[PDB]
Design a protein around this motif. Structure first.
Motif, PDB file in Angstrom:
ATOM      1  N   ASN A 167     -44.609 -17.435  -6.966  1.00  0.00           N
ATOM      2  CA  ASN A 167     -43.240 -17.779  -7.363  1.00  0.00           C
ATOM      3  C   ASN A 167     -42.197 -17.321  -6.346  1.00  0.00           C
ATOM      4  O   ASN A 167     -42.485 -16.496  -5.496  1.00  0.00           O
ATOM      5  CB  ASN A 167     -42.874 -17.251  -8.764  1.00  0.00           C
ATOM      6  N   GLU A 168     -41.005 -17.902  -6.437  1.00  0.00           N
ATOM      7  CA  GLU A 168     -39.835 -17.569  -5.607  1.00  0.00           C
ATOM      8  C   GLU A 168     -39.955 -17.793  -4.098  1.00  0.00           C
ATOM      9  O   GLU A 168     -39.330 -17.097  -3.297  1.00  0.00           O
ATOM     10  CB  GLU A 168     -39.375 -16.148  -5.944  1.00  0.00           C
ATOM     11  N   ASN A 169     -40.742 -18.791  -3.725  1.00  0.00           N
ATOM     12  CA  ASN A 169     -40.937 -19.160  -2.329  1.00  0.00           C
ATOM     13  C   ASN A 169     -40.117 -20.419  -2.016  1.00  0.00           C
ATOM     14  O   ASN A 169     -39.263 -20.784  -2.812  1.00  0.00           O
ATOM     15  CB  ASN A 169     -42.429 -19.295  -2.047  1.00  0.00           C
ATOM     16  N   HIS A 170     -40.352 -21.062  -0.868  1.00  0.00           N
ATOM     17  CA  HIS A 170     -39.584 -22.242  -0.457  1.00  0.00           C
ATOM     18  C   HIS A 170     -40.482 -23.411  -0.104  1.00  0.00           C
ATOM     19  O   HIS A 170     -40.235 -24.146   0.862  1.00  0.00           O
ATOM     20  CB  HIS A 170     -38.703 -21.899   0.762  1.00  0.00           C
ATOM     21  N   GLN A 192     -39.281 -22.746  -6.694  1.00  0.00           N
ATOM     22  CA  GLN A 192     -39.461 -23.073  -5.274  1.00  0.00           C
ATOM     23  C   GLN A 192     -38.126 -23.674  -4.875  1.00  0.00           C
ATOM     24  O   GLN A 192     -37.650 -24.596  -5.538  1.00  0.00           O
ATOM     25  CB  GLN A 192     -40.588 -24.057  -5.052  1.00  0.00           C
ATOM     26  N   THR A 193     -37.500 -23.154  -3.825  1.00  0.00           N
ATOM     27  CA  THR A 193     -36.187 -23.654  -3.397  1.00  0.00           C
ATOM     28  C   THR A 193     -36.144 -23.842  -1.910  1.00  0.00           C
ATOM     29  O   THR A 193     -36.684 -23.027  -1.186  1.00  0.00           O
ATOM     30  CB  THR A 193     -35.071 -22.681  -3.795  1.00  0.00           C
ATOM     31  N   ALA A 194     -35.500 -24.902  -1.441  1.00  0.00           N
ATOM     32  CA  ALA A 194     -35.438 -25.134  -0.007  1.00  0.00           C
ATOM     33  C   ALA A 194     -34.263 -25.961   0.424  1.00  0.00           C
ATOM     34  O   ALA A 194     -33.884 -26.905  -0.248  1.00  0.00           O
ATOM     35  CB  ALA A 194     -36.723 -25.806   0.463  1.00  0.00           C
ATOM     36  N   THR A 195     -33.693 -25.585   1.557  1.00  0.00           N
ATOM     37  CA  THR A 195     -32.579 -26.306   2.147  1.00  0.00           C
ATOM     38  C   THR A 195     -33.162 -27.022   3.359  1.00  0.00           C
ATOM     39  O   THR A 195     -33.599 -26.383   4.319  1.00  0.00           O
ATOM     40  CB  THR A 195     -31.464 -25.335   2.555  1.00  0.00           C
ATOM     41  N   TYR A 196     -33.199 -28.347   3.295  1.00  0.00           N
ATOM     42  CA  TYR A 196     -33.750 -29.166   4.392  1.00  0.00           C
ATOM     43  C   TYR A 196     -32.859 -29.185   5.627  1.00  0.00           C
ATOM     44  O   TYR A 196     -31.688 -28.825   5.563  1.00  0.00           O
ATOM     45  CB  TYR A 196     -34.031 -30.608   3.920  1.00  0.00           C
ATOM     46  N   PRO A 197     -33.429 -29.557   6.781  1.00  0.00           N
ATOM     47  CA  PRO A 197     -32.559 -29.622   7.960  1.00  0.00           C
ATOM     48  C   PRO A 197     -31.428 -30.634   7.729  1.00  0.00           C
ATOM     49  O   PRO A 197     -31.623 -31.584   6.989  1.00  0.00           O
ATOM     50  CB  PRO A 197     -33.517 -30.074   9.072  1.00  0.00           C
ATOM     51  N   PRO A 198     -30.256 -30.435   8.346  1.00  0.00           N
ATOM     52  CA  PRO A 198     -29.163 -31.390   8.114  1.00  0.00           C
ATOM     53  C   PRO A 198     -29.413 -32.715   8.821  1.00  0.00           C
ATOM     54  O   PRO A 198     -30.122 -32.739   9.821  1.00  0.00           O
ATOM     55  CB  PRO A 198     -27.943 -30.675   8.703  1.00  0.00           C
ATOM     56  N   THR A 199     -28.849 -33.800   8.300  1.00  0.00           N
ATOM     57  CA  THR A 199     -29.003 -35.128   8.906  1.00  0.00           C
ATOM     58  C   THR A 199     -27.713 -35.937   8.754  1.00  0.00           C
ATOM     59  O   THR A 199     -26.801 -35.528   8.048  1.00  0.00           O
ATOM     60  CB  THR A 199     -30.205 -35.890   8.312  1.00  0.00           C
ATOM     61  N   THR A 200     -27.652 -37.082   9.426  1.00  0.00           N
ATOM     62  CA  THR A 200     -26.478 -37.962   9.410  1.00  0.00           C
ATOM     63  C   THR A 200     -26.856 -39.381   8.972  1.00  0.00           C
ATOM     64  O   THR A 200     -27.934 -39.866   9.315  1.00  0.00           O
ATOM     65  CB  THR A 200     -25.845 -38.028  10.830  1.00  0.00           C
ATOM     66  N   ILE A 201     -25.974 -40.027   8.210  1.00  0.00           N
ATOM     67  CA  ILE A 201     -26.174 -41.406   7.745  1.00  0.00           C
ATOM     68  C   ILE A 201     -24.824 -42.128   7.770  1.00  0.00           C
ATOM     69  O   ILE A 201     -23.782 -41.474   7.807  1.00  0.00           O
ATOM     70  CB  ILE A 201     -26.768 -41.481   6.316  1.00  0.00           C
ATOM     71  N   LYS A 202     -24.828 -43.461   7.745  1.00  0.00           N
ATOM     72  CA  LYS A 202     -23.557 -44.197   7.757  1.00  0.00           C
ATOM     73  C   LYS A 202     -23.056 -44.458   6.329  1.00  0.00           C
ATOM     74  O   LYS A 202     -23.857 -44.585   5.403  1.00  0.00           O
ATOM     75  CB  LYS A 202     -23.647 -45.489   8.583  1.00  0.00           C
ATOM     76  N   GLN A 203     -21.729 -44.520   6.173  1.00  0.00           N
ATOM     77  CA  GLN A 203     -21.060 -44.757   4.878  1.00  0.00           C
ATOM     78  C   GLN A 203     -21.556 -46.087   4.305  1.00  0.00           C
ATOM     79  O   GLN A 203     -21.239 -47.140   4.843  1.00  0.00           O
ATOM     80  CB  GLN A 203     -19.523 -44.704   5.081  1.00  0.00           C
ATOM     81  N   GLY A 204     -22.366 -46.017   3.244  1.00  0.00           N
ATOM     82  CA  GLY A 204     -22.943 -47.204   2.607  1.00  0.00           C
ATOM     83  C   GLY A 204     -24.457 -47.126   2.428  1.00  0.00           C
ATOM     84  O   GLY A 204     -24.992 -47.643   1.448  1.00  0.00           O
ATOM     85  N   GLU A 205     -25.153 -46.495   3.376  1.00  0.00           N
ATOM     86  CA  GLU A 205     -26.615 -46.329   3.301  1.00  0.00           C
ATOM     87  C   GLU A 205     -26.961 -45.286   2.244  1.00  0.00           C
ATOM     88  O   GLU A 205     -26.100 -44.504   1.833  1.00  0.00           O
ATOM     89  CB  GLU A 205     -27.191 -45.788   4.631  1.00  0.00           C
ATOM     90  N   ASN A 206     -28.211 -45.268   1.791  1.00  0.00           N
ATOM     91  CA  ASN A 206     -28.612 -44.224   0.855  1.00  0.00           C
ATOM     92  C   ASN A 206     -29.916 -43.507   1.277  1.00  0.00           C
ATOM     93  O   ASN A 206     -30.953 -44.101   1.526  1.00  0.00           O
ATOM     94  CB  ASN A 206     -28.419 -44.561  -0.645  1.00  0.00           C
ATOM     95  N   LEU A 207     -29.769 -42.190   1.355  1.00  0.00           N
ATOM     96  CA  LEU A 207     -30.762 -41.220   1.815  1.00  0.00           C
ATOM     97  C   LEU A 207     -32.150 -41.151   1.164  1.00  0.00           C
ATOM     98  O   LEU A 207     -32.263 -41.034  -0.057  1.00  0.00           O
ATOM     99  CB  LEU A 207     -30.119 -39.841   1.645  1.00  0.00           C
ATOM    100  N   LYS A 208     -33.190 -41.163   2.009  1.00  0.00           N
ATOM    101  CA  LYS A 208     -34.588 -41.075   1.580  1.00  0.00           C
ATOM    102  C   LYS A 208     -35.171 -39.765   2.081  1.00  0.00           C
ATOM    103  O   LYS A 208     -35.358 -39.588   3.281  1.00  0.00           O
ATOM    104  CB  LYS A 208     -35.390 -42.262   2.102  1.00  0.00           C
ATOM    105  N   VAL A 209     -35.476 -38.865   1.150  1.00  0.00           N
ATOM    106  CA  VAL A 209     -36.018 -37.532   1.470  1.00  0.00           C
ATOM    107  C   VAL A 209     -37.504 -37.366   1.112  1.00  0.00           C
ATOM    108  O   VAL A 209     -37.987 -38.019   0.185  1.00  0.00           O
ATOM    109  CB  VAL A 209     -35.191 -36.448   0.750  1.00  0.00           C
TER     110      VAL A 209
END
Ligand SMILES: [Ca+2]
Ligand SMILES: [Ca+2]
Ligand SMILES: [Ca+2]
Ligand SMILES: [Ca+2]
Ligand SMILES: [Ca+2]
Ligand SMILES: [Ca+2]
Ligand SMILES: [Ca+2]
Length: 280
Positions: A167-170, A192-209
């Motif tokens: 427990n309490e890992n990432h 389990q918690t994690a902050t992914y690396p930051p990324t950029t997208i254009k206004q209108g597209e929708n993010l796939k993680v």
């Protein structure tokens, strides 16, 4: 190899803290006192907790063989990469290394190793496989910074493993095989918690993680999920279904330009994942 004995403690182990610790166990009043192989054989434990020791410092233990030491106590140290001490600790059965700032626990040959407490360390992406420690019964890696993806099949090389605390890992994935095999009488994988690396997208597209945990969780339950933007709820969609990929799409098409911190909050196994995003 080793340092020939008899010899003074400071010559055998030339690290102040370690030599004073050995001197204390053997009840010698000075690191200049001579020790024999018979003296090292009386040590059933290696008490080195809270001494500011690094991996380098500890490697000095390999200068000799503590033939009967069954316990290694190195908690509250500042280790980093822990050396392979199998040369010095052939009879090792128990490792108590809580909050010792260990970043790497290497594969090492410890036949008699039965228990290992590596909780509150800081492995990051260095997930240990425990090769050489096939006899392990219980592993504790609670709140140890374990991060990223881990294979479904890891930790299937330890036939007596009965307790695995994670427990309490990432982690963004689940070690499925071991939890589904039913060997484990005690287990934990909560928070389990994690902050992914930051990324950029254009206004209108929708993010796939990429979040395998979301789908793997289904092999342990049968339904909640929340999507937030900069801390506020955006929408609560129905839990997805697995059909061949671990990609999850989040509806960011309606969001305006600027900085956005997206979060997928899961709950019932449990956790949360952040995705820093810049929309142009
Ligand atoms: Ca001192
Ligand atoms: Ca003493
Ligand atoms: Ca003396
Ligand atoms: Ca606990
Ligand atoms: Ca069992
Ligand atoms: Ca699977
Ligand atoms: Ca699909």
């Amino acid at each position: 190899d080793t340092v020939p004995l008899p010899a003074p403690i400071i010559e055998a182990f030339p690290v102040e803290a370690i030599a004073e610790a050995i001197a204390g166990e053997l009840d010698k009043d000075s690191v200049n006192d001579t020790i024999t192989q018979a003296d090292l054989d009386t040590m059933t434990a290696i008490p080195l907790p809270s001494l500011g020791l690094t991996g380098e410092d500890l490697s000095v233990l390999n200068n000799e063989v503590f033939t009967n030491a069954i316990e290694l106590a190195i908690w509250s140290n500042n280790i980093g990469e822990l050396p392979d001490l199998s040369e010095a600790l052939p009879a090792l059965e128990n490792i108590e290394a809580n909050g010792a700032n260990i970043t790497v626990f290497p594969d090492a040959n410890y036949p008699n190793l039965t228990n290992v407490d590596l909780s509150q360390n800081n492995f990051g992406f260095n997930i240990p496989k425990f090769v050489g420690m096939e006899g392990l019964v219980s592993i504790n890696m609670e709140n140890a910074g374990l991060s990223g993806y881990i294979a479904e099949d890891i930790w299937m090389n330890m036939p007596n493993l009965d307790s695995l605390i994670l427990n309490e890992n990432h982690l963004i994935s689940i070690p499925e095989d071991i939890f589904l095999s039913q060997q484990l009488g005690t287990h934990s994988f909560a928070n389990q918690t994690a902050t992914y690396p930051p990324t950029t997208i254009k206004q209108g597209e929708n993010l796939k993680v990429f979040v395998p945990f979301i789908y793997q969780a289904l092999d342990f339950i049968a339904p909640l999920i929340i999507i937030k933007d900069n801390g506020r709820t955006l929408y609560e969609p129905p839990y997805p279904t697995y059909d061949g990929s671990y990609m999850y799409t989040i509806e960011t098409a309606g969001l305006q330009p600027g900085e956005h911190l997206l979060e997928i909050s899961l709950g019932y196994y449990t956790g949360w994942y952040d995705f820093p995003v810049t929309i142009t």
